[PDB]
Amino acid sequence: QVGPPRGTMVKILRPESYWFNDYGKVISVDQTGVRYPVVVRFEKVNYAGVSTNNYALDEVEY
Amino acid sequence: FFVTGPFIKLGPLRSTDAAELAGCLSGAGLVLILTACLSIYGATAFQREEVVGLKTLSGRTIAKDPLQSSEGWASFTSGWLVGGLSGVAWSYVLTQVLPYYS
Amino acid sequence: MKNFQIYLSTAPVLAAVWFTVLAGILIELNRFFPDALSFPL
Amino acid sequence: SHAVKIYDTCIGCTQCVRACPTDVLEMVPWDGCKAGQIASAPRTEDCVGCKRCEAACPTDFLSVRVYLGSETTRSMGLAY
Amino acid sequence: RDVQPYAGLTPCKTSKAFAKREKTELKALEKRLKKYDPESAPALALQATMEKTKTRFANYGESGLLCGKDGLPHLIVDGNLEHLGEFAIPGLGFLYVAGWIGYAGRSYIQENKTASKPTEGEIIIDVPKALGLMFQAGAWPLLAGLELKNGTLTAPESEITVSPR
Amino acid sequence: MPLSDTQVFTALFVALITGILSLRLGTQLYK
Amino acid sequence: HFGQLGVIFIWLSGMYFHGARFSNYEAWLSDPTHIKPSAQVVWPIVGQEILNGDVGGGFQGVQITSGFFQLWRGS
Amino acid sequence: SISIVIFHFSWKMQSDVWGSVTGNGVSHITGGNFAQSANTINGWLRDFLWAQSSQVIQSYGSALSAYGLIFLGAH
Amino acid sequence: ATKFPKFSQGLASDPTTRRIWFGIATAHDFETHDGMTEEKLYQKIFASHFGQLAIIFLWTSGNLFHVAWQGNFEKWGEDPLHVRPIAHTIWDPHFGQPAVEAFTRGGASAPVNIAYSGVYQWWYTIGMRTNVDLYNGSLFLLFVAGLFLFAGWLHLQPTFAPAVSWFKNAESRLNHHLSGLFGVSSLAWTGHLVHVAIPASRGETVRWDNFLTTLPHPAGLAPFFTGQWAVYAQNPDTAGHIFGTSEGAGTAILTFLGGFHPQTQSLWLTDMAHHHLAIAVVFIIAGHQYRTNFGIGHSMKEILEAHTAPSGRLGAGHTGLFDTVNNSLHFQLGLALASVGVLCSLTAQHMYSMPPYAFLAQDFTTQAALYSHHQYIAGFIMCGAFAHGAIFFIRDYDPEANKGNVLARMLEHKEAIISHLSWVSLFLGFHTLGLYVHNDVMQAFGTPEKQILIEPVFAQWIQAAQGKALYGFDILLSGDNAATAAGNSIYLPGWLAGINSSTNSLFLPIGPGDFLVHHAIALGLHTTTLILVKGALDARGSKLMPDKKDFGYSFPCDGPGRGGTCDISAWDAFYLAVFWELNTVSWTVFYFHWKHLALWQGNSAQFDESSTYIMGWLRDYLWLNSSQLINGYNPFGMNSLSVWAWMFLFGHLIYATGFMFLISWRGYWQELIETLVWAHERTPLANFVKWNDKPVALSIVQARLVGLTHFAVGFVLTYAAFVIASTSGKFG
Amino acid sequence: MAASLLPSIFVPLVGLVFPAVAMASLFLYIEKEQV
Numbered sequence A: 001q002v003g004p005p006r007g008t009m010v011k012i013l014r015p016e017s018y019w020f021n022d023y024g025k026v027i028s029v030d031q032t033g034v035r036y037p038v039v040v041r042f043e044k045v046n047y048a049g050v051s052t053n054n055y056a057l058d059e060v061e062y
Numbered sequence B: 001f002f003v004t005g006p007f008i009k010l011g012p013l014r015s016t017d018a019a020e021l022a023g024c025l026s027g028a029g030l031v032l033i034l035t036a037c038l039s040i041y042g043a044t045a046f047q048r049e050e051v052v053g054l055k056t057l058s059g060r061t062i063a064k065d066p067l068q069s070s071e072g073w074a075s076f077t078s079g080w081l082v083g084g085l086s087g088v089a090w091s092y093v094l095t096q097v098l099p100y101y102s
Numbered sequence C: 001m002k003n004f005q006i007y008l009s010t011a012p013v014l015a016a017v018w019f020t021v022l023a024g025i026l027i028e029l030n031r032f033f034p035d036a037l038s039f040p041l
Numbered sequence D: 001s002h003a004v005k006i007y008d009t010c011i012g013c014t015q016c017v018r019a020c021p022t023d024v025l026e027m028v029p030w031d032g033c034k035a036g037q038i039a040s041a042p043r044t045e046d047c048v049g050c051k052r053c054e055a056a057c058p059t060d061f062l063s064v065r066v067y068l069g070s071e072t073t074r075s076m077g078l079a080y
Numbered sequence E: 001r002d003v004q005p006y007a008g009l010t011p012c013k014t015s016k017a018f019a020k021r022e023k024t025e026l027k028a029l030e031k032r033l034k035k036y037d038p039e040s041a042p043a044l045a046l047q048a049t050m051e052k053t054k055t056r057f058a059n060y061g062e063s064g065l066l067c068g069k070d071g072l073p074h075l076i077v078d079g080n081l082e083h084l085g086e087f088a089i090p091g092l093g094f095l096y097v098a099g100w101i102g103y104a105g106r107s108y109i110q111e112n113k114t115a116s117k118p119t120e121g122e123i124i125i126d127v128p129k130a131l132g133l134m135f136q137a138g139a140w141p142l143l144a145g146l147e148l149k150n151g152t153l154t155a156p157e158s159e160i161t162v163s164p165r
Numbered sequence F: 001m002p003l004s005d006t007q008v009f010t011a012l013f014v015a016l017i018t019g020i021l022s023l024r025l026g027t028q029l030y031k
Numbered sequence G: 001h002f003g004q005l006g007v008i009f010i011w012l013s014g015m016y017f018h019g020a021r022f023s024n025y026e027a028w029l030s031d032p033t034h035i036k037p038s039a040q041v042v043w044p045i046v047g048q049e050i051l052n053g054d055v056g057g058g059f060q061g062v063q064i065t066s067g068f069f070q071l072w073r074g075s
Numbered sequence H: 001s002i003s004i005v006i007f008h009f010s011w012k013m014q015s016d017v018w019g020s021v022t023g024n025g026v027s028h029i030t031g032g033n034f035a036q037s038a039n040t041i042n043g044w045l046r047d048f049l050w051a052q053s054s055q056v057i058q059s060y061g062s063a064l065s066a067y068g069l070i071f072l073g074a075h
Numbered sequence I: 001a002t003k004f005p006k007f008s009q010g011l012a013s014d015p016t017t018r019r020i021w022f023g024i025a026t027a028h029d030f031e032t033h034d035g036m037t038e039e040k041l042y043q044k045i046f047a048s049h050f051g052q053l054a055i056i057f058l059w060t061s062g063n064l065f066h067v068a069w070q071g072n073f074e075k076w077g078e079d080p081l082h083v084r085p086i087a088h089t090i091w092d093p094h095f096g097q098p099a100v101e102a103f104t105r106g107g108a109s110a111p112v113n114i115a116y117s118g119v120y121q122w123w124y125t126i127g128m129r130t131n132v133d134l135y136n137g138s139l140f141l142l143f144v145a146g147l148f149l150f151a152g153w154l155h156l157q158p159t160f161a162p163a164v165s166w167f168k169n170a171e172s173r174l175n176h177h178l179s180g181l182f183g184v185s186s187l188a189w190t191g192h193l194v195h196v197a198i199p200a201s202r203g204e205t206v207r208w209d210n211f212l213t214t215l216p217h218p219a220g221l222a223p224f225f226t227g228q229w230a231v232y233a234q235n236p237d238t239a240g241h242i243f244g245t246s247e248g249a250g251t252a253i254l255t256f257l258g259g260f261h262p263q264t265q266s267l268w269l270t271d272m273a274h275h276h277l278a279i280a281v282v283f284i285i286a287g288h289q290y291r292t293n294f295g296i297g298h299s300m301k302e303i304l305e306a307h308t309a310p311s312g313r314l315g316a317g318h319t320g321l322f323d324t325v326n327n328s329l330h331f332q333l334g335l336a337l338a339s340v341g342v343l344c345s346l347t348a349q350h351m352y353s354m355p356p357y358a359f360l361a362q363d364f365t366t367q368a369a370l371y372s373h374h375q376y377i378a379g380f381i382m383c384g385a386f387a388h389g390a391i392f393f394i395r396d397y398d399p400e401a402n403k404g405n406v407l408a409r410m411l412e413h414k415e416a417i418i419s420h421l422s423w424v425s426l427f428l429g430f431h432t433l434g435l436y437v438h439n440d441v442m443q444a445f446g447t448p449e450k451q452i453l454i455e456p457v458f459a460q461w462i463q464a465a466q467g468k469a470l471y472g473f474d475i476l477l478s479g480d481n482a483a484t485a486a487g488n489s490i491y492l493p494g495w496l497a498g499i500n501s502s503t504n505s506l507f508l509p510i511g512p513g514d515f516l517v518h519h520a521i522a523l524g525l526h527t528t529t530l531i532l533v534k535g536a537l538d539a540r541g542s543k544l545m546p547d548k549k550d551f552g553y554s555f556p557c558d559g560p561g562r563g564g565t566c567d568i569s570a571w572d573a574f575y576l577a578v579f580w581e582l583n584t585v586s587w588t589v590f591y592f593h594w595k596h597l598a599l600w601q602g603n604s605a606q607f608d609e610s611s612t613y614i615m616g617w618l619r620d621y622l623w624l625n626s627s628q629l630i631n632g633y634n635p636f637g638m639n640s641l642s643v644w645a646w647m648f649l650f651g652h653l654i655y656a657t658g659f660m661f662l663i664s665w666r667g668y669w670q671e672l673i674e675t676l677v678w679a680h681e682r683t684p685l686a687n688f689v690k691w692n693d694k695p696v697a698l699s700i701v702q703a704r705l706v707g708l709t710h711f712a713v714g715f716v717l718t719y720a721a722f723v724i725a726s727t728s729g730k731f732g
Numbered sequence J: 001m002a003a004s005l006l007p008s009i010f011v012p013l014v015g016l017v018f019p020a021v022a023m024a025s026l027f028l029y030i031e032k033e034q035v
């Protein structure tokens, strides 16, 4: 297992992200070596209305 | 022939005795403008191949209209110019000649 | 009953009550202390 | 015609493809995402630019982007 | 009170144009009155309006107002001691009240942010807690000073979402 | 004193030359 | 639709009630040609009492243009 | 469209119908200027909008001061 | 494909009418042209600058020629106060006999237009007296325009075409423009004023014929080179001096009297000559600052590089900005536009209050027209400056190179700037509108004494500092201290005479209406700046659209997704800010025009009474002064203001037509055009004629622009018609 | 003589003749096929 454990709050570092500099719960991290394995869930919705998306290991901080 | 009439009866000089001459010169000027419009349309419009043919509603294959070509539209424009000037002159003649014109 | 109270606690009803009361107090102050261009001293 | 680009943040949810009204987008096999598929835009000439794909893309920021460019007949969506 | 002339403005109490304003309005009132017989209610209402105009003009005379060439009072807001009631004291009252409103709002939004479903409580206001925070916001300037000194008034730069630029 | 006709026509001919030069500049720009 | 009709009936009740306790309909009846109809009187609070115009009949109020006085006279 | 219908109605009635007979012919509100001025946009701007606005813009200090305030507010 | 988008293949292959529109629109956007190198970009820009300079000079020569040929310049010079200037003869075939008989003003024998541009006063002040002088000037400027057209043609040839590095030579360009384009030009103008304009003002005509024989001063250049420069100020013009005559005419050519010439109510020509001389000296000195070819002077790159705040509050300082400015044509264009717009505002604000032209203050319509002209030009130029800065941020800004400098810092705290602009705009608008509505209500309720009339004591205190003795602060020039004592040797008597006079507009008296309108102006400037700075800083991306820099400066939207992104581009921010710019400039010029109309009727009390509430502006200014304008033509004939009435209604028409393009949007119109295409295709005798380009609705950006253009055109034409017609109907 | 002649010639020249030729010419160029 790599990346943040499930349930932890991670600070988003992707500049273009709607939740940039915001904190979101980690739902799951894909261990099959995908490009964006970190699934982060967000209390607040973006302009598209979604509350989650995928991030890489260097696009999150905990 | 017809386009002269509005200038005769509603132009600036409609009240004056020279109403007819003014209206006919206005009609001739408009004929010249429309000749210019026709010449430029003929120069620009027919530049494409138009590979698709034409048929009648009965299904008979027919040749394209020679009018629908650059040189054909040029000949049509020349006919327009001659006809328009002759018609304007005829309208002048009839306004000066016709018994019940007023 | 209680749900109706909750309904009253909704944003529109509460805004209407709060601004009704506020307009009332401001009108009463302008009735009892009318025509106040500046704070007197 | 317009330009449609697919970025590696795509999760292969197919919503861009299903939203396209001119069949510009298609799903292709891809190892990068969990779902195992990325979108592509082969028939870019047919892109009218309606940006339904961008509206239907869940990923933040969008994995499909449409950049309006040279306007052709098909891009202008003209029946004449 | 008697105020010194300032910025080429004479006091309204000793201003002839202020007296003309009063006179004109009162005469208009009389004209309006004349058509009504004194026994009828509009006559008494108009007489009360005339009284109100007289006492307003008198109060504006005594309140140390400076009038202009036009004849209407003019406010001095540069901070002058003789005209502090024009802007400073009502300005202080507004700053106190507006800061109370804002601090009650900030306190409620921060308290509701800890609820299980903050957005539902955003539209259905918890009236008891709301009123508790509203009355606690009486000491807004103090509590704001505490927040400023402790650094919790302002969120740090890193926590705030920003554009990618 | 009104301008003489020779003055008006000389200035107008200078304008015509200026207009020719403007056309030369426009053609050169269009290249 | 029932609720809308209840609202309309509230509005009519208001108009008739104002035409009864806040109007000069009885004065206007004797002199309809010279008395201006009026069925709204404002409270004298912030100098808005000036809106109570000289509509006639020993009365002051906002002159009305709904024609309600004419309707009542015709009724 | 309604803005034009009601403007036509108001001007035509003030000019050619409404008025007061005094035994020496009709004295219309605007004096019958519609027939000779309502054929030009300038005529509507001047003899209807500009001319008839004097009542609403000079309404301050009277009972129609509310109408003047609403005029500005609606603008 | 077609040949008209010669610079755009992508538009050449476009099969619709959008091709024609966008080839017109993107013609001057050289940077986005196919196969466009930087060298071709710079050469074409250089030759276009040559071209429109020649256009400027042909416009000036045309004005001179028309005034010389069809004008009444001599007669106007004889009686400047009782002769209306003539602009040009009218030959309109559509005129009726009343129009021909009503437009014949001045001493013309033909219908004419009354020159409201002030060119008569300007040309009279500079020494031109006769139609021959104006004709000679027009011919000379015709030759100059031909010379510049030939120069553009020549520097477009490959031998004479300069490389990019010639344009990038900043130091040499600024040295030569400061010393020569500014400094030497000012010196030459001084030589003109001393040799020609001042002697012509004192009666003696000094043309090229008698040039080189009449000394401009009774002493020669002996006082100059012997250092006795005070001889040139020995005997100024007398107060009782009549312009253009020798009565009370002095001999001093250069001086600093200050104030205004009493008979013309304009600046003393000796003052303005001494002024241009001092500018010439300062700018010739200034143009030796930078290092070009001689081992001395500054290097601008290193100037910027060494100015970094030691504490790091500014970040890396200005490090990297030299290349940013020099390589970015849009940065340079935004700076030049910003400065030019500020200057145009300064000219508007200084020509009304300090008229530099003889008999300009007495001609009120020209003053109003010039103020409105320069303020509207300034507002548009400002909008352009900010738009081009947004364009710089998109096309020309390099975040990697500008890392850490003030510009990247602007990107970093842009949200704070935009939010505080929003705060100041909201505060100003809430309180200004509230005070205006309060005053409206109090006037409405018959109690105008209860209005919140804030006395603008700060501006009045400045005026008191500057010599005005109305308010009684008496601090700096109105009081008796060191500053006034130092001033009272040369300039201050004339300045105090000018500023304390009720006739001129040097520093007008200020009231609560002036307070409220200046705060309205502040609202307008703060809001327009909000919109424009928001457009510039969010040009490269925002939270709604992070990758906005990849879509160029002007794009319609990013679709209805993500809630909707209409008017999201920086171009759209400009488009929105032009409305606020027009609104603000209209507020300023409405204030100017009403205050000056009250001054010119002699009753300033009208403005001071009715400017505190909006109904007073609507009634006593707009409705009141529109009476004679709308009566330009009527069923009882017409008068000389019928053209301005027609233009007034014309501008109303354009404004409304603009509203059509602004409110209704593309997709209704596209379907309507589709039905029209079907109709034309299926109409007998009309299907013989077929369009070459497929007819389509205007694109979103195109139509936004078209509507904005109509809005602005109708705005400007309506107000121009109003400000000219009312002022000419009341004052000529 | 210039004053009595040149306006009556140049106003139609610039407001009817030059516009006609310019619009016609520009039309012919814009609609001119690339090849």
Ligand code: CLA
Pocket (backbone or CB within 6 Å): F011, F012, F015, I055, I058, I059, I060, I061, I062, I063, I065, I066, I070, I088, I089, I090, I091, I142, J006, J007, J008, J010, J011, J014
């Ligand atoms: C840009 C300057 C300018 C302007 C705005 C005008 C405006 C006018 N002129 Mg004047 N004129 C000018 C320069 C100008 N002129 C110059 C330099 C000359 C040469 C000395 C003349 C000589 C002249 C004569 C002799 C007459 C006019 C007439 C007229 C009137 C309309 C008829 C017309 O256009 O014929 C203009 C005639 C021409 C031969 C063209 C001259 C224009 C100049 C030289 C070129 C300007 C081009 C411009 C900068 C760029 C155009 C491109 C694009 C923006 C459209 C009108 C008031 C007539 C008039 O008074 O009618 C009542 C008339 O009889 N003009």
Ligand code: CLA
Pocket (backbone or CB within 6 Å): E087, E090, E091, E092, E094, E095, E097, E098, E099, E101, E102, E103, I422, I423, I424, I426, I427, I430, I431
């Ligand atoms: C009849 C009187 C009257 C009325 C109706 C208003 C109405 C209004 N004012 Mg104004 N104001 C008035 C008199 C009045 N004002 C006077 C006399 C002053 C001088 C003190 C001010 C100074 C003032 C300022 C400085 C501001 C307002 C703002 C506002 C708006 C929101 C105020 C509020 O409480 O929101 C509820 C309150 C909050 C949400 C809390 C926000 C912060 C508040 C406004 C101030 C507290 C900060 C603190 C004291 C530091 C102040 C710094 C300042 C000096 C720069 C509202 C439209 C605000 C506005 O619209 O600007 C965008 C604003 O910033 N007013």
Ligand code: CLA
Pocket (backbone or CB within 6 Å): E101, E102, E103, E104, E105, E106, E108, E109, E125, E130, E131, E133, E134, I419, I420, I422, I423, I426
């Ligand atoms: C919790 C209340 C609250 C507080 C403390 C603030 C504070 C601030 N706002 Mg915000 N704002 C609020 C509510 C609040 N706002 C609401 C409800 C709106 C929607 C209308 C806005 C809309 C808004 C805009 C559009 C802007 C601000 C700006 C600002 C700043 C300038 C001062 C100011 O308030 O003037 C602005 C004041 C107003 C717009 C008046 C609205 C405030 C109302 C009266 C508060 C309503 C809530 C109330 C307290 C009840 C809830 C609690 C209760 C249940 C107990 C400041 C940071 C400006 C900024 O960014 O400055 C840097 C700016 O441009 N605000």
Ligand code: CLA
Pocket (backbone or CB within 6 Å): I045, I046, I047, I049, I050, I053, I122, I166, I167, I169, I170, I172, I173, I174, I176, I177, I179, I180, I181, I182, I185, I343
């Ligand atoms: C002495 C040397 C000299 C001089 C006179 C000029 C002059 C000029 N250059 Mg420069 N240039 C020089 C050297 C010089 N250059 C050198 C060495 C280089 C190489 C680096 C360049 C490179 C260069 C480029 C690359 C360009 C120019 C351009 C221009 C022209 C700009 C237009 C202009 O003057 O606006 C008018 C401006 C003024 C007269 C000064 C402005 C003062 C302020 C804004 C106004 C004050 C006005 C005043 C109050 C009076 C107004 C009212 C009155 C009319 C009533 C101008 C004629 C541009 C061009 O192409 O034009 C052909 C251009 O693009 N130059």
Ligand code: CLA
Pocket (backbone or CB within 6 Å): I024, I025, I026, I027, I028, I029, I030, I333, I337, I380, I381, I382, I383, I384, I385, I387, I388, I391, I553, I554, I571, I574, I709, I713
């Ligand atoms: C010295 C000044 C200067 C310079 C060199 C430029 C140069 C440029 N600008 Mg900038 N700009 C300026 C001033 C300037 N502008 C000003 C003052 C404004 C504010 C109005 C703008 C606003 C602006 C925008 C918003 C944009 C540009 C763009 C551009 C570029 C392309 C222009 C274009 O699209 O083709 C030429 C433009 C046209 C042919 C359109 C003109 C249409 C006008 C408005 C019609 C007016 C109608 C007329 C007056 C009515 C007649 C009277 C009536 C009675 C009939 C080019 C780099 C565009 C670009 O892509 O930048 C890179 C762009 O998006 N500029």
Ligand code: CLA
Pocket (backbone or CB within 6 Å): I421, I422, I423, I425, I426, I427, I428, I429, I430, I433, I523, I527, I530, I531, I576, I577, I579, I580
């Ligand atoms: C008269 C017309 C008008 C008015 C009032 C406004 C007002 C505003 N615009 Mg808009 N705008 C307009 C026309 C107008 N605009 C047009 C035609 C354009 C061109 C598209 C724009 C383009 C535009 C842009 C692009 C921007 C603005 C911004 C602003 C704000 C500037 C700040 C300010 O002045 O705050 C003071 C606010 C006002 C005067 C608004 C009205 C507030 C009223 C007085 C309070 C009402 C209270 C009362 C109880 C209401 C009763 C209602 C009841 C029935 C509920 C403000 C909200 C800027 C902004 O958002 O800055 C923060 C901004 O970015 N506007």
Ligand code: CLA
Pocket (backbone or CB within 6 Å): I089, I090, I091, I092, I093, I094, I099, I113, I642, I643, I644, I646, J011, J014, J015, J016, J018, J019, J020, J022, J023
């Ligand atoms: C339908 C009515 C109508 C028409 C056709 C005209 C026509 C004319 N008037 Mg008259 N006028 C009218 C009504 C009309 N007027 C009315 C009601 C009044 C009020 C009483 C006047 C008052 C009046 C005055 C006071 C004057 C005129 C003048 C003129 C002439 C302008 C000279 C010219 O052609 O310049 C050339 C045309 C222009 C400069 C216009 C440019 C506008 C365009 C759209 C700008 C944008 C151009 C853009 C680049 C596209 C160009 C395309 C191009 C290639 C075709 C012209 C003969 C003037 C005159 O005779 O002077 C010589 C003059 O001084 N008129």
Ligand SMILES: CC1=C(/C=C/C(C)=C/C=C/C(C)=C/C=C/C=C(C)/C=C/C=C(C)/C=C/C2=C(C)CCCC2(C)C)C(C)(C)CCC1
Pocket (backbone or CB within 6 Å): I330, I331, I332, I333, I334, I335, I338, I342, I382, I385, I386, I387, I388, I389, I390, I392, I393, I536
């Ligand atoms: C967007 C952008 C841009 C543009 C911008 C702009 C447009 C700005 C503007 C700005 C402006 C427009 C500014 C202005 C300013 C001003 C000033 C800064 C002034 C000053 C003054 C002073 C300092 C004075 C002093 C004095 C006085 C008080 C009086 C008397 C005299 C004396 C001198 C003493 C750019 C390109 C850059 C960049 C990119 C982005």
Ligand code: SF4
Pocket (backbone or CB within 6 Å): D009, D010, D011, D012, D013, D014, D015, D016, D017, D038, D039, D056, D057, D058, D059, D062, D063, D064
């Ligand atoms: S682009 Fe957006 S929508 Fe289309 S597949 Fe990739 S993720 Fe799902």
